[PDB]
Amino acid sequence: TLRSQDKAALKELLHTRLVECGWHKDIKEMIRNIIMERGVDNINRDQLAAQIVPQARALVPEVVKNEMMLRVHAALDK
Amino acid sequence: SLDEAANYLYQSLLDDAVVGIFNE
Lengths: 78, 24
Known about the structure:
The complex is a heterodimer. Chain A is mostly helical. Chain A has helices at 4-20, 23-38, 53-58, 62-76. Chain A is 69% helix and 0% strand. By secondary structure, chain B is mostly helical. Chain B contains one helix and no strands. Chain B has one helix at 2-23. Chain B is rod-shaped, with a radius of gyration of 11 Å. Chain A binds chain B through residues 2, 10-11, 14-15, 18, 24, 27-28, 31, 49, 52-53, 56-57, 60, 65, 68-69, 72-73, 76-77, and chain B through 2, 5-6, 9-11, 13-22. Chain B: It is found in: Nucleus, Nucleoplasm; Cytoplasm.
């Protein structure tokens, strides 16, 4: 039950950490590598963002995850 | 109770960050 102000900020923050910490780089490696082995027309996209969603959550440094779970709590409970 | 709900927020914002990349 969020102040939609905070939502905008949480979204801006996640992006800033994920750039810094190399998460951005590694996800683009993964996609480029998957597509290179698949074929582009060959792929069935979302047969694709679905496949890697497990891997991407688990690539998140536990330090990043903790700061995020910090603010998400300080919001969901006011 | 909010526990499960905090996990839905984080997981939704994160799946939305993957698409972020994915579009460009």
